[model samples]
Target: VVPDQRSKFENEEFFRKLSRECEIKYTGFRDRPHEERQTRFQNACRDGRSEIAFVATGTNLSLQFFPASWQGEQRQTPSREYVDLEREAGKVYLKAPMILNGVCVIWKGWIDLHRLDGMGCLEFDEERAQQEDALAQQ
Candidate 1:
């Protein structure tokens, strides 16, 4: 019922190792259905799939990872600042935060290179606000 070692973000070594084995692929957007996006992303990111394999897409949570009671109220802002991937030869990474069982942590994942290529321009929706600090700039 709980996530396995590779499914959780507690270990970077494992993430890197597992990612290497998966040899993820990015076949462009709208290549899959919304309901099946997560599964397709995970599948494209890795091989066919496994019980412990999962992925991140947009703001949704994975069916395999995360806790049962992980409601919005339980998620807290992470203290760890965003890392400058340019600081290193890092793979594409997306991140967010949460407070689980009173412990603060993040939800980090590898993104398809499509985003890095500036191809994320979907023609709809309110713009992203997490990165834009409207109130922080007093």
Candidate 2:
């Protein structure tokens, strides 16, 4: 396996010291099954982050709702969604708020900075990778 130093990066104190909020795009909402989205949602809780949806995909983000919730939220009309976002050094902190069913839910994740391109340290093929698949998604 081609090891990525960034993956093993454990001393994220540098990110905290340089913390600042940045606008991020969480693309790939349409194609992903609710399962994948839900996994990232739960994963973010314990890891302080979630999976990367896209690498600088654009400017808006979405939280994937579970199938039942998605249907219920829509059927009820006037769906509510919002977010609070921040970035520290190279870390992404996200808070997602969306109301579904009879309950209002909020999710927060400390994600991002996991990629070198955003970190200004792109390696071989990383730039091409971005061009071919980063800005856009399947």
Candidate 3:
């Protein structure tokens, strides 16, 4: 859930914790399908025909994580700008924001990684956007 405008961004801690346990995998471009990917998540909900768990894929959320460096870093890191907060090494970490449909105009939308009870998988659409973007850029 997005934090309220008035509330401090700190509220994202809840999402951070949930996201950690959930472990969202972002997919875009060709990842989209007619039906929900989770529904056909290789028997995610059904075990040899049994409904074991649920998984959602192709969720429309974009996020970026910076490379963590140890104390002896040569380059100086910049402060937080337009990034989100997440916990790392017992401290809150900065992450890049993921904008829905960033590479495309319309899509099935991103699924909630945290919402899945079973193994949820996501894959990136290779070249689908580059092909289109190339045409558009022309």
List model 2 lDDT by residue over 95-118, tens digit each: 444333212233343434332122
Query: Candidate 2 at residue 130, lDDT?
Result: 27
lDDT of 3 by residue, 1-138 (tens): 222321432343433332332333323222446344434322222221112211232333433333323345544433232112212222222223222232222211123323322232222233443454444443
> What TM-score, over all chains together, does every model reach?
0.22, 0.23, 0.19
lDDT of each: 0.32, 0.33, 0.30
Off by over 4 Å in 2: 1-61, 64-89, 115-138
Off by over 4 Å in 3: 1-99, 104-116, 136-138
Give the C-alpha lDDT of model 1: 0.32
Most TM-score-accurate candidate:
2
How many pairs of residues collide in each model? 0, 3, 9
Which regions in candidate 1 have their CA more than 4 angstroms from the true location?
A: 1-29, 32-59, 62-90, 112-138
Mark the 10 consecutive residues where model 2 has the least summed lDDT: 116-125
- Best first by lDDT, ranked: 2, 1, 3
Q: What RMSD value applies to candidate 1?
A: 16.6
lDDT of 2 at 12: 39
